[PDB]
Amino acid sequence: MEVNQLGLIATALFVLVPSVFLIILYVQTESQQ
Amino acid sequence: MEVNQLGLIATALFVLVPSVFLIILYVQTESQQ
Amino acid sequence: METITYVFIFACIIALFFFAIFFREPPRIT
Amino acid sequence: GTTGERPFSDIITSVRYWVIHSITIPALFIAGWLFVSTGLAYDVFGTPRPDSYYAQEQRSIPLVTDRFEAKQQVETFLEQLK
Amino acid sequence: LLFFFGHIWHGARTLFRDVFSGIDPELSPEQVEWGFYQKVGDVTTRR
Amino acid sequence: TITPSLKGFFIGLLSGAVVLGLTFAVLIAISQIDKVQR
Amino acid sequence: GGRIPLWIVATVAGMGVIVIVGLFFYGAYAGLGSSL
Amino acid sequence: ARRTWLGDILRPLNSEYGKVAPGWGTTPLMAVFMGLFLVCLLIILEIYNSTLILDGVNVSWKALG
Amino acid sequence: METLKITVYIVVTFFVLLFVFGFLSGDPARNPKRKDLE
Amino acid sequence: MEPNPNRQPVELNRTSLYLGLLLILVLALLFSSYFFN
Amino acid sequence: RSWLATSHFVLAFFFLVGHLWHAGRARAAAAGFEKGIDRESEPVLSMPSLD
Amino acid sequence: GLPWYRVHTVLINDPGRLIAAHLMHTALVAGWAGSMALYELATFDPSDPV
Amino acid sequence: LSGLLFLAACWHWVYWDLELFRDPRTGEPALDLPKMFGIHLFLAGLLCFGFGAFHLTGLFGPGMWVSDPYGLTGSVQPVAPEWGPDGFNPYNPGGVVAHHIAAGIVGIIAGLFHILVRPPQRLYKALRMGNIETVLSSSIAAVFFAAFVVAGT
Amino acid sequence: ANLWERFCNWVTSTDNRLYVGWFGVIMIPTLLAATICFVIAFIAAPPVDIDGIREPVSGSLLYGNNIITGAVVPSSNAIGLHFYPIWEAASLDEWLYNGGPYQLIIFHFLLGASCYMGRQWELSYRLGMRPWICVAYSAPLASAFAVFLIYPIGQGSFSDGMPLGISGTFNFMIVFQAEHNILMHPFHQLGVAGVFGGALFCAMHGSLVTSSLIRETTETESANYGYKFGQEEETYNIVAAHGYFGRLIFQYASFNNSRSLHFFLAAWPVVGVWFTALGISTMAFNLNGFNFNHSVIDAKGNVINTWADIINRANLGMEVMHERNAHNFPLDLA
Amino acid sequence: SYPIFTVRWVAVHTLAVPTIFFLGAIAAMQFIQR
Amino acid sequence: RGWFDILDDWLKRDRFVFVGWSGILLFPCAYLALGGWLTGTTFVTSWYTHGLASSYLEGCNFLTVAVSTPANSMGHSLLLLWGPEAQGDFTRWCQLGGLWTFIALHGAFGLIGFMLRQFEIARLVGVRPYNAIAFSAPIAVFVSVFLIYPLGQSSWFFAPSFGVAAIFRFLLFFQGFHNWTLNPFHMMGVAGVLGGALLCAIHGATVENTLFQDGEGASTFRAFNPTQAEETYSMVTANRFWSQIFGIAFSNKRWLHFFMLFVPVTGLWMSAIGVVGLALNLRSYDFISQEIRAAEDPEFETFYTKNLLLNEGIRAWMAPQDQPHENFVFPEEVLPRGNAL
Ligand code: CLA
Ligand code: CLA
Ligand code: CLA
Ligand code: CLA
Ligand SMILES: CC(C)=CCC/C(C)=C/CC/C(C)=C/CC/C(C)=C/CC/C(C)=C\CC/C(C)=C/CC/C(C)=C/CC/C(C)=C/CC/C(C)=C/CC1=CC(=O)C(C)=C(C)C1=O
Ligand SMILES: CCCCCCCCCCCCCCCC(=O)OC[C@H](COP(=O)(O)OC[C@@H](O)CO)OC(=O)CCCCCCCCCCCCCCC
Ligand SMILES: CC1=C(/C=C/C(C)=C/C=C/C(C)=C/C=C/C=C(C)/C=C/C=C(C)/C=C/C2=C(C)CCCC2(C)C)C(C)(C)CCC1
Ligand SMILES: CC1=C(/C=C/C(C)=C/C=C/C(C)=C/C=C/C=C(C)/C=C/C=C(C)/C=C/C2=C(C)CCCC2(C)C)C(C)(C)CCC1
Ligand SMILES: CC1=C(/C=C/C(C)=C/C=C/C(C)=C/C=C/C=C(C)/C=C/C=C(C)/C=C/C2=C(C)CCCC2(C)C)C(C)(C)CCC1
Ligand SMILES: CCCCCCCCCCCCCCCCCC(=O)O
Ligand code: OEX
Ligand SMILES: [Cl-]
Ligand SMILES: [Cl-]
């Protein structure tokens, strides 16, 4: 199927950027005293 | 120029995955008592 | 690539289910 | 707690309330009935009567097609009904 | 449109800053009882 | 030149002024007649 | 105050509402809007 | 708190925090100006909307010539 | 296909029998408050 | 350099992590078809 | 056929709801907790935590 | 601690750092304008305005 | 400009604790928001008036894009203000010049007023003018008004 | 204890992380089968001849669909209501061509969901609760039954069941409107009241409780930390919430009784959805929405159109275009 | 001791009076013939 | 006291129906919107704007009456009674559709007034403003659908007409011309509405089935007292039940009720954004990859392509009567049709 080429990176970044934001916040909460 | 299409996502992930790993570790170190 | 992307996202969601159920923060009464 | 108005149950179970409303309610109902049966509603709101949607041999709707001449277009349609 | 929601949110925060973390634990039931005050929320108008 | 639409605009502005002014005058009068007792 | 019992008031008012709605359905089958 | 040359110059402009005029002050004048502004907005809107039509004011691209 | 059909029949019968005999095995008494419900 | 007294620690509990990941993954699943078009 | 089928599907379904309602309530009332949980003997409070 | 959606409230009573944050937003906006203009220049074909 | 703003942001972040930001009477951080509004309104009015009187008119500046009614011969031209009723016609470019001149002057005058005259106590308390979040609320309102207007035009 | 006694104790144990129960003994295998078959089919199944005219429709991702367009396609109109298990096919190739996965999936799902409802009852009994959460669940379950079993029974074919996919759902809805005028059916109107009002009351209740939270935290902390799991005292002031809402509308339009309030919250959407499920399940037997086509006529006899006639034009477009190669005769009688 | 005319009275009647009038009108409409 | 303060006192008196300063805006506008709807649906026609009968007086019923939008030739005119179209003629105003703009405008300002009422009452009684905040969703829906969408289209004519059947026609028009069901913003709206209904039902039922026994009656409603300090149902038991049934469960009541606010409100906002898009015909109409494949391969078919055929049918068969100003004449031979139907 002739899909939009940029769809792959669009989807990958859409998932990864917010997910990593959340993971950073969670881990640094866990490590607090 | 007729470049490899997957080069963009390859480069983006090559940069982002290790960088986010490091950022997670650093922030959770900073938040420790 | 598109099929791989769809299936990957779905598998991630299922793994999330697993962790949210069996590795939740336990409710604790005061 | 209540805000000081007379209770509705007290009002609607009272003789005076119904002395007043056994007159007022029927009067308003009859006013509306007559508003329709005398044909005044058609005139007031510009609503076609069953015999005033079309001319006798007409089948095209009288659609308004010009913004600033719409009033005159409607009046022309009404005259063409005659 | 989204900024309309932003206006509502931040204006509400401004006008209700004193209850942002919750309402008064000592809130008098009389202040919400009907007919107790002549004027809603004005204890100077007690009946 | 006072166009018909400008006359209509004046009519609408004055009608709104009358409506609002009557509303507020009535409210002020009633509030003065029926005051809260402190 | 309570000269006319409230249950009587409620029953009569409900009967009136029922009659009005029934007449409207009768109109659905008669006169204008009846398809005939 | 650090003092600087520019900060010293600007000091007077941030020295009246909390200062107010008694009571209503200029509120009635503000109210009049608000009413005038609202009426002006209504006029401009009606012109753009073709509800108010003025001689010499053709609301179309043909206003370009 | 016949082997599949027989296998499915056996499996379904197994689970249905579990259901029936389990609910027959004194289910009403399996509650936290009052057991002797007859 | 005197520290800034306005600093505050930030938190995200595990339930919030799970909820946020669910939101993000479901939004991705929804919008990916339109991104690929 | 349409009138009868529709009417009696409606009736059959609502009577399934009735079965569920009255069967559940009968079980709860026979066991003695159809009016609610006893505060001083809340069953769950005596159970081990799931995790 | 602060929930994730309140992190920037630390600026409410810190005028200097509020000015710093506003400067950063302004810098990002100006940089976007420049980058967008350069991308459009790299892509634009000026040979037929008709 | 972006780079310079980045450097200035770093400086202000590090040197947050400036005496200018403290109330002389109490030593607490404080901003006199009403006078800030007067000052910034005066500056905005000056810039608006200059844009109208010099840039758009071509007196000192290039002017603005103008074309015929069918978009065949557009070009950048100086534009004179239109002070009559046709100045409020959205399709008349002279109205833009006139608006920016007149609105800029009004901004200058009103900014002087808001610099010199303190808010009434009634309004200060009603609008919580001691709380910067009130400015955020009203500014957001003004911005979404403007966004709707530009979308429409 | 004997082996059976031990097994029964384990099955009915309230200490299992997930309750099993006797309903669960049926639910677990059936839902697992339905899930596994659905996932595999959605990803990889070949095209299915839904309408029985040798015109296979592609439903799976590997055969050209995306998440929005993909679906498990209903079984062939040639099969009708016939039971089509794998072992009734000559081969898996035939089974797939004729759409057997749909039957396997929906049957196992309906059975498993019924057992899910029963399991809700059973665990409530084990925990000493009142029993009617399952009654709440009966509304969506009835809806599933209506679209997967009842409508196919009434119309004579599982090919007319709702497809297991997003765009397939839309197709089902549009054809349903064309053939039954569901929008003009009072039961669907009650369903809309149910769901609009459910969302409305959800927002209302959430907002009122949130507005009446009692102060237990500072502005730098989430107010949610003001409540401790299992605390004895209420966390919001229902008296204040009632004062607010009663003054918003008027005193007697606001609940002062939390139990009455929560009963109303349960009842409104549940009853609405029951009625909409009955709407689908009764249009299954071709008792359709109101038909006012040409109801208004003038003195001569000219038809005066109404919005209902406009609706009818749209419905005609749908009707003439749907399943464009399947009809040979003038009337679409099922 | 209660007042007769109040804000509540005004609200009630603003709704009630036109309602009866309209119901009379619609009742009358039921007997129109084309 | 000053007259302003005396007026404030009177407006904020505690009475059966609270008035407030917001009342001065809310009550006249809400009354005019509602009364206009009832008046139009009872007596007013749509003959000159749509070619439709739309009132009880013409023979319509509750499902088919409407206050219909003005004619397309009116553009986006405010259609003021004193405006240049009606020129102060009330009958002509009604015949030209001035009631639609009358209702829409007085209703919009009534919504503003009602939200202000929420704020004012919350402030007076000392509660937080979250009910007003949640009301922003209905306002966003109303603005996007009844003002922004027509403002982006050719005229008010294509806004929804205020009626049951008219709204249904709006739904079907959006399907046929916009493929609205395929739009991910409508999809999020659907999720918000259905999930809100689900939360409403599940929370009500859970509370009612984890009540504590606080009385001897078999009807459990009398066992609650509004001034009591104790919770009326067992959060611990409810949490255990849902943990074991569904895998996860709420453990924090404050989060639970905020989530109930969040879901439906967010869904409605997303739908409003989608409609803003549709105001410009900025649709999620097609998937380009599927269209390319189908154009090249006449054996490729999906439910997506089937629905597109349905849309083409809707457009062709409804346009001539639904858009009378276009003067469409579609000869029978050009109408799309399947075999035999
Ligand atoms: C001039 C605009 C403006 C400004 C300066 C603020 C400033 C503030 N807001 Mg308000 N807000 C605005 C507009 C604005 N808002 C609008 C338009 C909305 C509606 C969408 C809101 C809705 C809103 C809510 C609901 C809340 C705030 C809160 C806050 C405070 C904390 C924000 C924070 O820490 O976020 C931190 C945010 C992140 C760490 C990540 C956000 C990621 C977003 C969702 C996606 C990415 C956006 C992208 C990167 C930027 C593109 C922007 C561009 C398109 C314009 C802060 C005082 C909070 C508050 O009052 O706290 C007490 C709060 O709860 N705001
Ligand atoms: C649903 C709409 C809505 C709501 C609930 C609020 C609510 C609020 N606003 Mg916001 N506001 C809105 C819309 C809204 N606003 C709009 C559209 C604007 C214009 C951009 C503003 C501009 C604004 C400012 C500048 C400020 C507020 C403030 C406030 C707060 C105090 C109340 C107030 O000032 O009332 C505002 C009163 C109204 C919105 C009602 C106006 C009624 C008008 C006059 C009727 C006019 C009729 C018109 C002439 C008919 C002809 C038009 C027709 C031909 C088209 C409160 C949080 C203040 C605040 O945040 O303080 C902390 C503040 O400073 N608002
Ligand atoms: C001779 C002097 C002069 C002249 C010729 C002009 C000329 C002009 N002015 Mg300026 N003006 C002047 C002096 C002057 N001005 C002065 C002294 C002031 C006081 C500082 C202003 C303040 C002013 C403002 C505030 C505005 C203008 C605007 C305009 C333009 C009007 C045409 C237009 O596009 O309207 C378009 C705008 C409208 C028709 C107003 C619409 C009002 C909306 C509908 C109110 C409701 C908004 C709310 C958010 C609800 C939206 C809901 C919706 C989404 C459904 C035009 C260029 C307008 C402009 O910039 O237009 C681009 C404008 O908004 N003027
Ligand atoms: C708060 C109440 C309220 C509000 C906000 C509105 C708002 C509106 N109405 Mg509704 N109306 C109301 C009450 C209200 N109405 C009541 C009570 C009635 C029954 C009497 C009506 C009857 C009504 C009709 C019949 C119509 C409207 C219409 C309108 C719209 C246009 C209004 C306009 O242009 O006014 C402009 C007026 C003003 C902005 C007032 C300005 C006041 C200033 C102070 C005047 C200053 C100058 C002036 C000359 C003063 C001179 C003083 C001195 C020289 C003597 C607008 C949406 C029209 C509509 O819906 O069109 C589709 C329409 O045709 N209204
Ligand atoms: C210009 C001029 C003249 C202005 C002057 C105007 C003026 C000042 C007038 C004076 C007043 C006046 C004369 C009156 C006007 C009269 C009048 C009738 C005009 C306006 C009429 C009109 C247009 C509007 C009427 C329509 C109206 C708004 C009614 C809506 C009623 C409605 C359906 C309400 C729903 C009720 C309902 C039970 C909802 C349940 C919601 C729910 C489940 C809440 C959950 C919940 C509830 C709780 O309870 C508590 C506790 C908690 C926890 C909780 O979760
Ligand atoms: C205590 C209630 C708890 C149960 C929750 C109720 C479920 C929801 C019910 C909602 C509808 C209410 C039915 C009445 C429930 C009920 O208990 O009825 C009884 C109630 C009070 O009756 P009485 O005056 O007899 O009161 C006796 C008192 O002495 C104590 O009961 O009557 C009314 O409120 C009806 C009056 C209609 C008022 C019409 C006024 C129209 C004004 C228009 C302006 C409106 C304001 C607009 C705001 C913007
Ligand atoms: C109260 C109330 C109400 C209302 C109600 C109503 C309105 C009712 C009515 C009712 C009625 C109104 C009833 C009636 C009944 C009757 C009866 C029950 C009768 C019987 C009869 C008979 C049995 C007969 C027989 C016979 C025969 C068979 C033959 C010939 C001879 C004779 C005729 C004798 C409401 C809801 C509002 C509210 C709440 C309360
Ligand atoms: C330092 C310095 C410098 C340099 C500078 C630079 C080089 C800069 C750069 C800058 C830049 C280069 C910037 C950029 C920026 C960007 C941005 C900021 C972006 C944004 C984005 C966004 C925000 C997006 C969003 C979105 C998406 C993504 C999708 C769709 C939707 C939306 C649109 C929402 C100089 C030498 C000069 C000087 C000295 C100093
Ligand atoms: C527009 C306009 C205006 C105003 C008007 C108004 C304000 C009106 C109102 C009116 C109204 C205010 C009306 C009302 C009516 C009502 C009705 C028509 C009702 C009906 C009812 C019904 C039919 C119901 C039924 C039922 C049922 C079915 C069941 C349950 C019970 C009941 C009874 C609910 C003016 C003057 C400014 C002038 C300009 C234009
Ligand atoms: C903000 C408050 C707005 C209130 C507006 C009230 C409107 C009342 C209008 C009633 C009189 C209409 C004028 C009729 C004559 C106008 C004819 C014309 O010259 O065009
Ligand atoms: O397969 Mn599905 O859809 Ca029920 O109607 Mn006949 O069959 Mn077909 O046509 Mn129309
Ligand atoms: Cl089809
Ligand atoms: Cl056939």
CSV table of N, CA and C in Angstrom, one decimal, chain P residues 248-278:
chain,number,residue,atom,x,y,z
P,248,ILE,N,-8.4,-4.0,37.6
P,248,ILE,CA,-8.1,-2.7,38.2
P,248,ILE,C,-9.3,-2.2,38.8
P,249,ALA,N,-9.1,-1.2,39.7
P,249,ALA,CA,-10.2,-0.6,40.4
P,249,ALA,C,-9.8,0.7,41.0
P,250,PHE,N,-10.7,1.6,41.2
P,250,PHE,CA,-10.4,2.9,41.9
P,250,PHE,C,-10.0,2.6,43.3
P,251,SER,N,-9.1,3.4,43.9
P,251,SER,CA,-8.8,3.4,45.3
P,251,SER,C,-8.8,4.8,45.9
P,252,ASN,N,-9.0,5.8,45.1
P,252,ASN,CA,-9.1,7.2,45.6
P,252,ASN,C,-10.3,7.9,45.1
P,253,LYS,N,-11.2,8.2,46.0
P,253,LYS,CA,-12.5,8.8,45.6
P,253,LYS,C,-12.4,10.1,44.9
P,254,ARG,N,-11.5,10.9,45.3
P,254,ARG,CA,-11.3,12.2,44.7
P,254,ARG,C,-10.9,12.0,43.2
P,255,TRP,N,-9.9,11.1,42.9
P,255,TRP,CA,-9.6,10.8,41.6
P,255,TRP,C,-10.7,10.3,40.8
P,256,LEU,N,-11.5,9.4,41.4
P,256,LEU,CA,-12.7,8.8,40.7
P,256,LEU,C,-13.6,9.9,40.2
P,257,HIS,N,-14.0,10.8,41.1
P,257,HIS,CA,-14.9,11.8,40.7
P,257,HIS,C,-14.4,12.9,39.8
P,258,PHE,N,-13.1,13.2,39.9
P,258,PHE,CA,-12.5,14.1,38.9
P,258,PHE,C,-12.5,13.4,37.5
P,259,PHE,N,-12.2,12.1,37.5
P,259,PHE,CA,-12.2,11.3,36.2
P,259,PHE,C,-13.6,11.4,35.6
P,260,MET,N,-14.6,11.3,36.4
P,260,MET,CA,-16.0,11.4,35.9
P,260,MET,C,-16.2,12.8,35.3
P,261,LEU,N,-15.7,13.9,35.9
P,261,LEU,CA,-15.7,15.2,35.2
P,261,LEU,C,-14.9,15.1,33.9
P,262,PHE,N,-13.7,14.5,33.9
P,262,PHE,CA,-12.8,14.7,32.8
P,262,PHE,C,-13.2,14.0,31.5
P,263,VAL,N,-13.8,12.8,31.6
P,263,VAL,CA,-14.1,12.0,30.5
P,263,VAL,C,-15.1,12.7,29.5
P,264,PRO,N,-16.3,12.9,29.9
P,264,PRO,CA,-17.3,13.5,29.0
P,264,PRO,C,-16.9,14.9,28.5
P,265,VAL,N,-16.3,15.7,29.4
P,265,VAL,CA,-16.0,17.1,29.0
P,265,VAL,C,-14.9,17.0,27.9
P,266,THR,N,-13.9,16.2,28.1
P,266,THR,CA,-12.8,16.1,27.1
P,266,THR,C,-13.4,15.6,25.8
P,267,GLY,N,-14.2,14.6,25.8
P,267,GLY,CA,-14.8,14.1,24.6
P,267,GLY,C,-15.6,15.1,23.8
P,268,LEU,N,-16.4,15.9,24.5
P,268,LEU,CA,-17.2,16.9,23.8
P,268,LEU,C,-16.3,18.0,23.2
P,269,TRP,N,-15.2,18.3,23.9
P,269,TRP,CA,-14.3,19.3,23.4
P,269,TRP,C,-13.6,18.8,22.1
P,270,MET,N,-13.2,17.5,22.1
P,270,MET,CA,-12.6,16.9,20.9
P,270,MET,C,-13.6,17.0,19.7
P,271,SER,N,-14.9,16.6,20.0
P,271,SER,CA,-15.9,16.7,18.9
P,271,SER,C,-16.0,18.1,18.3
P,272,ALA,N,-16.0,19.1,19.2
P,272,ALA,CA,-16.1,20.5,18.8
P,272,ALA,C,-14.9,20.8,17.9
P,273,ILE,N,-13.7,20.4,18.2
P,273,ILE,CA,-12.5,20.7,17.3
P,273,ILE,C,-12.8,20.1,15.9
P,274,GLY,N,-13.3,18.8,15.9
P,274,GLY,CA,-13.6,18.2,14.6
P,274,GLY,C,-14.6,19.0,13.8
P,275,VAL,N,-15.6,19.6,14.4
P,275,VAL,CA,-16.6,20.4,13.7
P,275,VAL,C,-16.0,21.7,13.2
P,276,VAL,N,-15.1,22.3,14.0
P,276,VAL,CA,-14.4,23.4,13.5
P,276,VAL,C,-13.7,23.1,12.2
P,277,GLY,N,-13.1,21.9,12.1
P,277,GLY,CA,-12.5,21.5,10.9
P,277,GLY,C,-13.5,21.4,9.8
P,278,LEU,N,-14.6,20.7,10.0
P,278,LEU,CA,-15.6,20.6,9.0
P,278,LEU,C,-16.2,21.9,8.5
